[PDB]
Design a protein around this ligand. Structure first.
Ligand SMILES: *[C@@H]1O[C@H](CO[C@@H]2O[C@@H](C)[C@@H](O)[C@@H](O)[C@@H]2O)[C@@H](O[C@@H]2O[C@H](CO)[C@@H](O)[C@H](O)[C@H]2NC(C)=O)[C@H](O)[C@H]1NC(C)=O
Ligand SMILES: NC(=O)c1cc[n+](COC[n+]2ccccc2/C=N/O)cc1
Ligand SMILES: NC(=O)c1cc[n+](COC[n+]2ccccc2/C=N/O)cc1
Ligand SMILES: CC(=O)N[C@@H]1[C@@H](O)[C@H](O)[C@@H](CO)O[C@H]1O
Ligand SMILES: CCOP(=O)(O)N(C)C
Ligand SMILES: CCOP(=O)(O)N(C)C
Lengths: 531, 530
């Protein structure tokens, strides 16, 4: 028996595997149970901690993907299949993974904890692009990632009720963070230096842990990649969540009233059946809206994330935030009129005006025209190419860039040191069409060092670029500064608004995360909706 | 005596005067009475045609200026005094002026009619900058200008009442226009070729004659320089007009019945009325005027905006334009932090205060949309950028975008439109350089004032003035400013082409602040409704 692959955590003993990487070996503990399986009577309930076990649990492979919708838009196409479950769908999915250097570190080492995205309805820690072996080998870091319940299984809420309190998917993440504090030292890891990093809904989750006091004590730095908790999609009100919880029950057949009788009927339904109706709940066919997301309940989140962002004191905290260059294009192929991955998507003006209401759903007619005013070039009001880029900017700015910018500015002004980036390299292996640019999510594979995988076909240049980005992230985890203690990465402040661009070229500093556009979304448009 | 200087019109005989020019003489007939003096019981009443006279009317000097406020803000400053009255004030002021070539033309000659501006509260046809001798010597048209009543005397309205129906200053202009049709031929004019041209409130007046059928059959072409009938300042509703008239009565000690109140105002000396007209404004503004044309269903059957969108304008040729910095002039009269004697480098708090002063409403959220569009959010506190931005706010809202909207609607409904931006700063300009090319400082080049050797213009500016007089007169003859050479293309709603007028040859450009004007003409209007 290899002593390096045997570790004792507070619940019992574990056996791991030695993963081969180009640089050398790393120790992986994949599929460690951290909660009791949330099934049967435990569906929709907060996670119960894993009861201790006798013997040795083999943590040698990724456990099941939490039950979730599978995207069928472009079957067999790499650009969509890379995000689809690469394990079996099961409600028994509350397992986490740990990567550590081989041999185990002598002194305590800082942790990265990955929270995957997927619109709070999908995602898994087992995806190839989340493979932790390259980061941990290259930077001698401990990487942890966990599965959390998505969809109705994680975020269906009948607020006030004990059976469907909502936000249990977030509590899954919290329990995993609690697990990291009690047990990461056994893997040679430092529980006093734990950096959350996540992407999209993962980034939004990271932010909600920043705004929830019981979670704040579990980590010390944050990285928010192409997402934020204050995005118009990341939360719902109690009333909205309740209306979506019972509408799901009705299309499912519940009841054939009491909140307990309602959810008890929901528990008798097979998991696939909830997934298949999940959607038909949204008040409007849109893009960038998701049926079951965290609920502003007064518990996990005492107020809305904006109220909390604005009222928070963030001294002693370090944050790394950023977006891709073309946050918007990925979502337009999924339902906006005139768009496909298989043509140039040169839309008409009528299609642009229609796409605006799909991309900015649930707003007054006056609000929609303000969007049309600011994003139309009135010297070329009908140029199809400009209309396509403009719609991409609309839903990209509204959903991602402007929420991230708003967060970064409040954090910087209120005592946190912020660091901002725009990821602008288009991978040589990208399967999406050229007009989509640098789409949402396609910096992840470079942060995890995927180009170092000999199985893949990235250029030698892209490999060096991943090694540089891995160093930035690890530098931030250790120091809270991505800079090497070489062009300097300046902190982001509300005034200067400095960020750097990430591509094959050296770091270049720029100012403003779409400052003109985001002034519309973060300053004016809220005051239009009140009045 | 000189037979060229004697002309007989319907009302009787007049005697003119020969005037000199560096290119030869021209004939002037200044101070021709075209209406009965609107005094005493005729105050606020529509003009009555001048009754025939016996004898010879002396038409050798300008007549009195209509009673108006006099600008006392920078006493003795050229840039100020050039617009102030240069003749004595009087309610006896309804006179017009005719300039013809010398000797008088034998064939019918195209006629230009000038309507001065001055916010509908001031102005005079006698001002040096409106001297017609150069235009008519160089281009051999007939030129006419009239005085019309301004302020309360021209536009005080008690709608419905007969004692103060409003818009009589516009009727003064119409009456003079009727006078031209009946009498311009006696000077060699062609009443079948009358081009209206005016600046600022005069341009808005021209536009209103475009939209009023009784005026429309009285001219053939129109030039609107830095003004529109659809400006947020050029018209007023019936209710707001009535409120302003009654407050002015209260301010002058009149109570408080339409008949009794007009009667009491008729007893007040004219200067008393002038001293208070500005105090009936509901706010502390720039670019808003107490007594302006009223939309009452008579002169204007509807709002100028409504009449523009409904109009068929085939067979109409219009010349429209603005100067480069329409807003800068108006900020030294009240925007916080501005002066002509400093660089006016304002702070954000001043810029924000200056937005409520430039765009008098809405009361709460509309102000927010303006500051959003006009802030550079990478440089939100740069004073130089804020000075320039508040100038754009005032200029766009009040002039540029009303012009752009009129031009687009007229073009898309059958009119041939020519658009210009005047971008030359005169070497003689007395205003500071941060004001650029201010509002009003294209006129002197249009009237060929640089040709006067007594002034201090350059050789390049004299050629520029001659080129401008040629464009305007070309348009008055043919509806096309182009010389029958880079070409001035018509302005269309899609291409939005215009030319820059400066010492360089014509340069074609697209868009009269297309982005800024989308906000003012498309979004903002909808915001108010909801
Ligand atoms: C670009 O493609 C979109 C998407 O539809 C295509 O139609 C398929 C038959 C196939 O050829 C793929 O390229 C795409 O999936 C086009 O939008 C469609 O247009 C048709 C007719 O107007 C309509 O019936 C569909 O409903 C439309 N789909 C959507 C999502 O709007 C678009 O016209 C194409 N643009 C081009 C060719 O310039
Ligand atoms: N629960 C559902 O049925 C359901 C259906 C569709 N979507 C939206 O999915 C489309 N989509 C839209 C944008 C990006 C990705 C994807 C697909 N990801 O798997 C969410 C839930
Ligand atoms: N009666 C009025 O509305 C009114 C408005 C403004 N002013 C004075 O405004 C100053 N001003 C501002 C801009 C141009 C000229 C002048 C001055 N008049 O010659 C007088 C009367
Ligand atoms: C009309 C006018 O501006 N006249 C001035 C004159 O007063 C001055 O003396 C001269 C330069 O000396 O320039 C010119
Ligand atoms: C599609 C995954 O991206 P993320 O989760 N999100 C907010 C859309
Ligand atoms: C004041 C001169 O310009 P015009 O009259 N305008 C401002 C109404």
């Amino acid at each position: 028996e290899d002593a390096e692959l045997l570790v004792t955590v507070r619940g019992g003993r574990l056996r791991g595997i030695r993963l081969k990487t180009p640089g050398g070996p790393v120790s992986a503990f994949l599929g460690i149970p951290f909660a009791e399986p949330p099934m049967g009577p435990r569906r929709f309930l907060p996670p119960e901690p894993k009861q201790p076990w006798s013997g040795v649990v083999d943590a040698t492979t990724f456990q099941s993907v939490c039950y979730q919708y599978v995207d069928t838009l472009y079957p067999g196409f790499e650009g969509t299949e890379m995000w689809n479950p690469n394990r079996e769908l099961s409600e028994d999915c509350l397992y986490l993974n740990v990567w550590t250097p081989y041999p185990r570190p002598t002194s305590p080492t800082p942790v990265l904890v990955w929270i995957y995205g997927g619109g709070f309805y999908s995602g898994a820690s087992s995806l190839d692009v989340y493979d932790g072996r390259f980061l941990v080998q290259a930077e001698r870091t401990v990487l942890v990632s966990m599965n959390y319940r998505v969809g109705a299984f994680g975020f269906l809420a009948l607020p006030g009720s004990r059976e469907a309190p909502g936000n249990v998917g977030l509590l899954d993440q919290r329990l995993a963070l609690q697990w990291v504090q009690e047990n990461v030292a056994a893997f040679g890891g430092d529980p006093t230096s734990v950096t959350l990093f996540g992407e999209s809904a993962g980034a939004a989750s990271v932010g909600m842990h920043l705004l929830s006091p019981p979670s704040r004590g579990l980590f010390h730095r944050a990285v928010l990649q192409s997402g934020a908790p204050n995005g118009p999609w990341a939360t719902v009100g109690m009333g909205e969540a309740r209306r979506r919880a019972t509408q799901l029950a009705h299309l499912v057949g519940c009841p054939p009233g009491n909140d307990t009788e309602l959810v008890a009927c929901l528990r008798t339904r097979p998991a696939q059946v909830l997934v298949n109706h999940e959607w038909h709940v949204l008040p409007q066919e849109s893009v960038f809206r998701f049926s079951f997301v965290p609920v502003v309940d007064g518990d996990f989140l005492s107020d809305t994330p904006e109220a909390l962002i604005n009222a928070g004191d963030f001294h002693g905290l370090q944050v790394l935030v950023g977006v891709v260059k073309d946050e918007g294009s990925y979502f337009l192929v999924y339902g906006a009129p005139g768009f496909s991955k298989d043509n140039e998507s040169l839309i008409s003006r009528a299609e642009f005006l229609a796409g605006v209401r799909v991309g900015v759903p649930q707003v007054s007619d006056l609000a929609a025209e303000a969007v049309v005013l600011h994003y139309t070039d009135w010297l070329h009001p009908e140029d199809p190419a400009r209309l396509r880029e403009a719609l991409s900017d609309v839903v990209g700015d509204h959903n991602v860039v402007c929420p991230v910018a708003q967060l970064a500015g409040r954090l910087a002004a209120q005592g946190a040191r912020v660091y901002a980036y725009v990821f602008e390299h288009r991978a040589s292996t990208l399967s999406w069409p050229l007009w989509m640019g640098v789409p949402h999510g396609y910096e992840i594979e470079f942060i995890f060092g995927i180009p170092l995988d000999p199985s893949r076909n990235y250029t030698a240049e892209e490999k060096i670029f991943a090694q540089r980005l891995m160093r930035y992230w690890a530098n931030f985890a250790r120091t809270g500064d991505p800079n090497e203690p070489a062009p300097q990465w300046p902190p982001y402040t509300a005034g200067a608004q400095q960020y750097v661009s990430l591509d094959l070229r050296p770091l270049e500093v720029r100012r403003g995360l779409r400052a003109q556009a985001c002034a519309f979304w973060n300053r004016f448009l809220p005051k239009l909706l009140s009045a």
